[PDB]
C-alpha cells in the first residue's frame, strides 16, 4: 500500500503549524476525514483533527459542513482508553457552537454513557470537558434530563466540587447542577434529600468569583416551580408509559427466549445480561416512581427561603459580576413572589413618609442597597428591576387613588385592605439577623423600553464562550513574538534603563540645588491629591470637586480632565497606581468608601472603568473625617484600607475576599500608613493622637499588635503628618508631626534613633532627603543636616516626589497653580 495517507497527514501538519495565518479552507480536510476508518492511524488523524478544531469557530463550521459528525458519533461505540480524552475534547469543542442541533443524536445508542463513564468510572481538565458536554446535553432538553440524572453522577459531582483543584470544573459542576434544577420537582426533591443543596450552599464561600456567581445561578434555578401541580402529573404520565413499554419489551424478550432452543455460547448468552440490564432499568423506574408521591412542595419552599438568607451576606462581595448576578436573582424573586413585595412596599414607603420585620424586608432593603452600586450598568439594572414595582403600585387597580394621595407626600379601611393580602400568600405557604444597616446618605427619587420581569442571565453564554479561545496553544499577547509582546519588551527595556539611571543619579541630590523651577500648570482649582506616575512621565491630580486631571509635564500638556462620578458632598481622598510595570490603572478612593479602578486614563475618548466596589462600609461621615486611607502592596496584591472605622481591613485581589481585619485598639483617627513592598509582612500606621504602632499579619487579629510608642516626649496628642518607610536605600522609618518634629525610628528597638526639626513631611523613595512644608520649603538630609531652602512663589497644600527622578511638586492653599522643581548639579 502507498504512503499517500502519511504524506497528506504530514502536509496537514505543516498547514496547521505554519500556514494557519489565513483563515481559508485547508484543502487537505477530506483526506484526514477519509483516514478516520482504519485502525492504522486513527489516533494521529484524530489528534491532528483536534488541533485543527482548536483554532476557532471557523474550523468547526468547516468541519461540520463536510460531515465529521457521523464519524465522531460512530467512534463512540468503539471502546479504547486512548481515544477517550481525544473524543471528549473533540466533543467539548463541537458542542460549544451549535448545541441546538447536536443534542438529540446522543440519545440514540446510549451515547451519553461515554461521558458518564469518563466522569464516573483522566485529568481534571478531561473531567471538565466531560461535565461541559453533559451540561450542553442537558440545556433546555427535558428528555435528556431523565437520561443524565443519576444518583452516582450527582454524588461524584458533589465529591468533585468538595475537592477538585482546577477551578474550571469547580465552575462546570455547579453549572451542571443549576441546569439539572431547571424545572423538575422530582430532581429538586432528590437533590435536597441527598444534600447537594448543602454542598452548593457551602460552595458560596470560595476563592475565585466565577464559582460564586455559578452558585448564585444554581440557586436562581432552585426556585421550586409555578406550574408544579401540573408538571408533577406531566412527569408521572411518561414514567407510567416508560414502565409499561419496558415491561412489554421484557415479556417480548421472554417469549423470544422461550423458543425451545438452548443456543449455548450464542444469542441466549448474549441475552441474559440484557435481561437483567432491562430489570435494572425497570427497578430504577419504580425507585423514581416511589420517590414521586412524597414531593412536599412546602418543604421545597422552606429550603428555598432558607437558601435566600444565606445568599444575602454576599452583598459586600468583590466584583460587579456577582453583584449583577445578585440583582438578576432578586429580580426573579420579585417575579415569583410578587404580592409580598407589593404589600411590603406600601408599608415601607408610608413609614418613609412618616407589618415588616421578616427576612423578606431584608431582601427589599438589599435591592435598594444594590440600587446605589458604584458600577455603571448595575445602577440602571437595579433601577429597571424596581421599575416593575413602581409601575405596579402606580395603579394596583383600585389602589391608584390612595397611592397618589400618599404620593403627594413625597415632596414634603385601607389598613385592612393592605393587611388582607398578607394571609393570601401566608396560607399558600402551607439567626434571623436582618440587622438593617445602611449608610442612608442618598434617597431613591421615584436601554430597553419595556420590561420583562424575570430578567435574563447571559452568564451561561459567557461561560460557553470560554470554549472557543485556544487551549492547546497559548493565546495572543503571550506568544514568543507579537505586537503586544514587542510592546512589553519595549516597556521592560524602559523600566530597566530608568531603574539603572536612578541608581546612577542617587547621589546627586545630596549636594545639588533645589531652588530651580521646571514648569507651572493651572489646574483651575485647588488640588490636594498629587501623584507622579512611577516610571512613565505623567502627573495625576485630584481636588475637592472630584475632578481628576492628568498632566504630561514633558510637553506641558493637559491629557484629560474628567469627573469621578462620586455623589456631591464627598471628596476623593487617595490616588494610586495599579500594575505600574506594564500598564498603570488609576485607583481613586473617596471618603465614602467607593473604590474605583480606571483604564486608559490619559485619553478622554477611550477611558473606561474596569471595577468598582466598596472596600469599607461602616464609616460615618464626620466633619473631621480623615476619609478612606489606603495603601498598596503589589507582591502580595494586598490593599490595606481604613478610615472612620476602628479596624484596618486587608483586601485581596486574587480572590477578591477580605482576608483579615485588624483592630486599631484606639479611638483616634488614622493619618498615615505604610508597608514594606518586598517582604510584605510588616506595616506601620501613624495615628492622629501621636501614637506610632507596628502590627503583624502573621499572627491572630487579637494579638496582631506588636509594639506601640508615642511620637515625642510630650503627653499631649500631637497631630502626625506622615509616616513613611522608604522602598530602597537603608529603609529608614521617618515620621513627621505638625509641631515640626521629625523622627527616625526602628521597629525592633523602642527609643527613637534620630530626631530634629508644618503642613506635610515628604520623603523621596530613594534619595536620602526629608522635605518639610512651611512658608519656606526646606529640604534636609535623613541624617539631620539641612541641604537647601527656598520659597514657592500663605501655606503649602502638599508635596510629592517623582519616585525615581528628582522631581518635587508644590502647590499653595487657595492657589490653582502647581509648580515642579528639578534637582540638578
Amino acid at each position: 500500500f502507498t504512503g499517500f495517507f502519511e504524506q497528506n497527514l504530514t502536509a496537514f501538519e505543516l498547514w496547521l503549524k505554519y500556514a494557519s495565518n489565513v483563515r481559508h479552507p485547508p484543502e487537505q480536510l477530506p483526506i484526514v476525514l477519509q483516514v478516520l476508518l482504519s485502525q492504522v492511524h486513527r489516533i494521529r488523524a484524530l489528534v491532528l483533527l483536534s488541533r485543527f478544531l482548536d483554532l476557532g469557530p471557523w474550523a468547526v463550521y468547516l468541519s461540520l459542513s463536510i460531515g465529521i459528525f457521523p464519524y465522531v458519533l460512530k467512534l463512540l461505540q468503539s471502546p479504547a482508553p486512548e481515544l477517550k480524552p481525544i473524543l471528549v475534547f473533540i466533543w467539548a469543542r463541537i458542542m460549544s457552537i451549535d448545541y441546538k442541533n447536536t443534542q438529540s443524536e446522543l440519545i440514540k445508542e446510549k451515547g451519553y454513557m461515554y461521558f458518564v463513564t469518563v466522569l464516573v468510572p483522566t485529568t481534571d481538565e478531561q473531567k471538565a470537558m466531560a461535565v461541559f458536554v453533559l451540561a450542553s446535553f442537558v440545556r433546555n432538553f427535558p428528555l435528556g434530563q431523565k437520561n443524565c440524572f443519576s444518583l452516582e453522577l450527582v454524588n461524584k459531582l458533589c465529591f468533585y466540587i468538595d475537592n477538585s483543584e482546577i477551578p474550571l470544573l469547580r465552575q462546570w459542576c455547579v453549572i451542571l447542577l443549576g441546569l439539572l434544577f431547571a424545572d423538575n420537582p422530582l430532581n429538586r426533591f432528590v437533590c435536597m434529600n441527598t444534600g447537594a443543596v448543602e454542598i452548593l450552599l457551602k460552595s458560596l464561600k470560595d476563592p475565585v468569583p466565577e464559582v460564586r456567581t455559578a452558585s448564585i445561578f444554581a440557586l436562581k434555578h432552585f426556585i421550586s416551580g409555578f406550574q408544579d401541580a401540573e408538571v408533577i402529573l406531566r412527569l408521572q404520565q411518561e414514567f407510567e408509559e416508560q414502565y409499561q413499554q419496558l415491561h412489554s419489551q421484557l415479556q417480548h424478550l421472554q417469549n423470544q427466549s422461550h423458543l425451545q432452543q438452548q443456543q449455548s455460547q450464542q444469542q441466549q448468552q448474549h441475552l441474559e445480561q440484557q435481561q437483567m440490564k432491562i430489570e435494572k432499568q425497570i427497578r430504577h423506574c419504580q425507585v423514581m416512581q416511589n420517590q414521586l408521591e412524597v414531593i412536599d412542595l412546602r418543604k421545597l419552599k422552606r429550603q428555598e427561603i432558607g437558601n435566600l438568607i444565606s445568599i444575602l451576606p454576599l452583598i459586600n462581595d468583590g466584583s460587579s459580576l456577582v453583584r449583577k448576578e445578585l440583582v438578576v436573582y432578586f429580580s426573579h424573586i420579585v417575579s415569583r413572589y410578587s404580592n409580598f413585595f407589593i404589600v411590603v412596599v406600601f408599608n415601607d414607603l408610608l413609614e418613609e413618609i412618616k407589618s415588616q420585620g421578616s427576612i423578606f424586608y431584608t431582601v427589599w432593603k438589599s435591592l435598594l442597597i444594590l440600587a446605589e452600586d458604584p458600577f455603571l450598568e448595575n445602577k440602571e439594572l437595579s433601577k429597571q428591576v424596581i421599575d416593575y414595582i413602581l409601575l405596579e403600585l402606580s395603579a394596583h387597580k383600585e389602589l391608584g387613588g390612595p397611592f397618589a394621595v400618599m404620593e403627594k407626600f413625597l415632596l414634603k379601611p385601607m389598613r385592612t385592605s393592605l393587611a388582607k393580602l398578607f394571609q393570601s400568600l401566608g396560607f399558600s405557604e402551607s439567626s434571623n439577623t436582618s440587622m438593617k444597616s445602611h449608610t442612608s446618605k442618598k434617597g431613591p427619587s421615584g436601554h430597553t423600553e419595556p420590561l420583562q420581569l424575570p430578567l435574563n442571565s447571559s452568564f451561561l453564554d459567557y461561560s460557553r464562550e470560554y470554549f472557543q479561545e485556544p487551549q492547546m496553544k497559548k493565546q495572543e499577547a503571550d506568544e514568543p513574538g507579537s505586537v503586544e509582546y514587542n510592546a512589553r519588551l519595549w516597556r521592560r527595556n524602559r523600566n530597566e534603563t530608568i531603574i539603572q539611571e536612578t541608581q546612577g543619579e542617587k547621589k546627586l541630590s545630596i549636594y545639588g540645588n533645589w531652588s530651580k523651577k521646571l514648569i507651572s500648570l493651572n489646574n483651575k482649582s485647588q488640588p490636594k491629591l498629587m501623584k507622579f506616575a512611577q516610571f512613565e512621565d505623567q502627573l495625576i491630580t485630584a481636588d475637592d470637586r472630584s475632578t481628576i486631571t492628568v498632566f504630561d509635564w514633558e510637553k506641558g500638556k493637559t491629557l484629560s480632565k474628567f469627573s469621578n462620578g462620586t455623589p456631591f458632598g464627598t471628596k476623593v481622598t487617595d490616588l494610586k497606581l495599579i500594575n505600574e510595570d506594564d500598564s498603570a490603572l488609576l485607583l481613586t478612593g473617596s471618603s465614602d468608601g467607593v473604590i474605583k479602578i480606571y483604564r486608559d486614563y490619559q485619553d478622554v475618548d477611550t477611558f473606561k472603568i474596569v471595577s468598582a466596589w466598596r472596600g469599607l462600609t461602616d464609616m460615618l461621615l464626620t466633619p473631621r473625617s480623615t476619609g478612606l486611607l489606603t495603601e498598596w502592596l503589589q507582591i502580595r496584591g494586598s490593599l490595606l484600607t481604613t478610615g472612620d472605622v476602628k479596624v484596618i481591613r486587608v483586601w485581596d485581589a486574587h480572590t477578591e475576599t477580605v482576608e483579615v481585619d485588624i483592630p486599631a485598639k484606639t479611638s483616634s483617627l488614622i493619618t498615615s500608613l505604610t508597608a514594606d513592598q518586598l517582604a510584605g509582612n510588616i506595616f506601620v500606621a501613624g495615628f492622629a493622637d501621636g501614637s506610632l504602632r507596628v502590627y503583624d499579619r502573621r499572627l491572630d487579629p487579637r494579638d496582631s499588635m506588636i509594639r506601640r510608642w508615642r511620637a515625642g516626649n510630650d503627653k499631649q496628642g500631637v497631630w502626625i503628618n506622615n509616616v513613611h518607610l522608604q522602598r530602597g536605600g537603608y529603609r529608614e522609618l521617618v515620621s513627621g508631626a505638625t509641631n515640626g518634629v521629625v523622627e527616625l525610628w526602628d521597629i525592633r528597638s523602642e527609643d527613637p534613633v534620630e530626631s530634629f526639626v508644618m503642613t506635610c513631611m515628604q520623603v523621596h523613595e530613594h534619595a536620602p532627603i526629608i522635605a518639610t512644608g512651611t512658608k519656606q520649603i526646606k529640604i534636609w538630609t535623613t541624617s539631620g543636616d539641612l541641604l537647601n531652602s527656598f520659597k514657592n512663589s500663605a501655606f503649602l497644600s502638599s508635596m510629592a516626589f517623582h519616585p525615581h527622578r528628582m522631581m518635587i511638586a508644590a502647590t499653595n492653599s487657595h492657589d490653582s497653580i502647581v509648580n515642579i522643581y528639578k534637582c540638578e548639579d
Partner: protein, 381 residues
C-alpha cells in the same frame, strides 16, 4: 505577576456582542448555519439497463474500419457466437459491476427491447417505486444517432427495422427522480431535448393549464439528473485499442480502466508486461481495505472527493455529493470521466454543469503516482 487584568475584569460578564458578531474584522467568526443535512433522503432502489446492442450489424449512418472498437464490458463478442453475449453476458457483467456502487439496489435488464416491452420495463418500475429514484442507463451502438427532434431508437420482434421513441413519451413513461447515463454517439442532442421538453411541460402546466396526465408531479422533473458522453455533433472513437463504451466504463468501474489507460498513456512502455491491450491483474477486492485493490479504491475515493470539494461551490457540492450514496458515486466517477474522456476528442456533459478546472486540477498527479507505486509492487511480484 499582574492583577486586576483578567477576563472577568476585561469582559464584565457580558457575552460577545451580536452587533459585532457579523462584522467579522479578523475573519474569525465566518458562519455556516445550514451545516446539518435535513435527513430527507431520496434513495435509489431500481434501475433500467437499456442495451441496444444487436451484435454483428452496424447502423447505416456511421462508416467503420474493418478492425473496430468491439469489446463491451470486458467481454468480447467474437468468443461467443451469436446471442450468449448479446445481452445475457454483457448485462450480467454490467449488473455485477453496478453492484459495487450500491448493493441494496435491485436490477433487471433489457433483452434488446421493443416498444411493447418498454411499456412494462418502465411503468412497472414507476408503479413499484413511488418517489425513489430510478436509474436509466442507455447504451446504443446498433442504433442510428439520436435526432434533433428528440428520439431514440429500439428494435422490433424480428430485429428488422429501427423504430423511434420520443423522449417526451419516455419521460411520461417514467417519472420525476432520474439519473440518466447516456452512451450514444451524440448525447448532447437528447440532453437539450429533455431540457426543452421539461420547460415545455412547465409552460404548458403553468400558463396553458392543459396539464397532461403525468404519473409524477410537474415541478419534480427538475430533480431528474443527466450525464452524457458527447458535447456536440462529434463522433466517438472506433479505435481498436480502447473499449467501445469508455464513458460507461468510467461511470461504472473507475479503478480498472483508469489503471489501464494509465498503462496506455505512460511515456515508458519498455520494461512492462505488454492492438496490444495490457493484461493488468490486481489482487484484492473493492470493499476490502488491506488489499491493494481496496487501498486503490480508498485513495481514489479520497482524492476525487478532495478535487470536487476544492473546485465546486458549496450548495452544488452539498446537492451532488452529500445527499445519497448512489448519485455521489456516479458523480465521483464523472469527475474521472471529465479528465480521461477529453484526452480522446470527446467532451462529457452533465445536466448540472461543472467548472472546467476538473481536467486541469493539479491534484491528479498524486493519483498517478499512487498507481505507479502500486504497479511497481505488482510488477516486482
Amino acid at each position: 505577576i499582574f492583577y486586576f487584568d483578567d477576563k472577568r475584569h476585561k469582559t464584565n460578564g457580558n457575552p460577545i456582542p451580536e452587533e459585532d458578531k457579523q462584522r467579522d474584522v479578523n475573519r474569525y467568526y465566518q458562519p455556516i448555519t445550514d451545516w446539518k443535512i435535513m435527513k430527507d433522503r431520496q434513495k435509489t432502489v431500481s434501475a433500467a439497463l437499456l442495451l441496444c446492442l444487436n451484435l454483428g450489424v452496424d447502423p447505416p449512418d456511421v462508416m467503420k474500419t474493418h478492425p473496430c472498437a468491439r469489446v463491451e464490458a470486458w467481454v468480447d463478442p467474437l468468443n461467443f457466437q451469436d446471442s450468449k453475449k448479446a445481452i445475457e453476458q454483457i448485462g450480467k457483467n454490467l449488473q455485477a459491476q453496478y453492484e459495487t456502487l450500491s448493493l441494496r439496489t435491485r436490477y433487471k435488464q433489457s433483452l434488446d427491447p421493443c416498444v411493447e416491452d418498454v411499456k412494462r420495463f418502465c411503468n412497472s418500475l414507476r408503479r413499484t417505486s413511488k418517489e425513489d429514484r430510478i436509474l436509466f442507463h442507455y447504451n446504443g451502438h446498433g442504433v442510428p444517432k439520436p435526432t434533433k427532434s428528440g428520439e431514440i431508437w429500439v428494435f422490433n420482434r424480428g430485429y428488422t427495422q429501427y423504430i423511434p421513441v420520443s423522449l417526451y413519451d419516455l419521460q411520461t413513461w417514467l417519472g420525476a427522480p432520474c439519473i440518466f447515463v447516456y452512451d450514444c454517439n451524440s448525447a448532447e442532442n437528447i440532453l437539450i431535448n429533455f431540457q426543452k421538453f421539461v420547460q415545455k411541460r412547465i409552460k404548458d402546466d403553468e400558463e396553458g393549464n392543459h396539464d397532461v396526465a403525468a404519473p409524477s408531479p410537474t415541478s419534480a422533473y427538475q430533480d431528474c439528473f443527466q450525464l452524457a458522453s458527447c458535447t456536440s455533433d462529434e463522433l466517438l472513437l472506433m479505435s481498436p485499442e480502447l473499449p467501445a463504451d469508455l464513458f460507461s466504463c468510467c461511470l461504472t468501474c473507475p479503478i480498472e480502466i483508469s489503471i489501464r489507460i494509465f498503462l496506455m498513456q505512460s511515456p515508458l512502455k519498455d520494461s512492462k508486461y505488454k492492438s496490444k491491450i495490457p493484461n493488468v491483474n490486481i489482487p484484492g477486492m473493492l470493499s476490502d481495505r488491506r488489499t491493494p485493490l481496496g487501498e486503490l479504491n480508498w485513495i481514489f475515493t479520497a482524492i476525487t472527493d478532495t478535487i470536487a470539494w476544492t473546485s465546486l461551490p458549496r450548495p452544488l457540492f452539498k446537492k451532488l455529493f452529500r445527499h445519497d450514496l448512489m448519485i455521489a458515486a456516479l458523480f465521483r466517477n464523472f469527475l474521472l470521466a471529465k479528465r480521461i474522456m477529453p484526452w480522446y476528442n470527446c467532451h462529457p456533459v452533465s445536466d448540472p454543469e461543472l467548472p472546467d478546472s476538473i481536467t486541469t486540477h493539479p491534484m491528479w498527479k498524486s493519483w498517478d503516482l499512487a498507481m505507479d507505486e502500486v504497479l511497481t509492487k505488482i510488477v516486482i511480484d
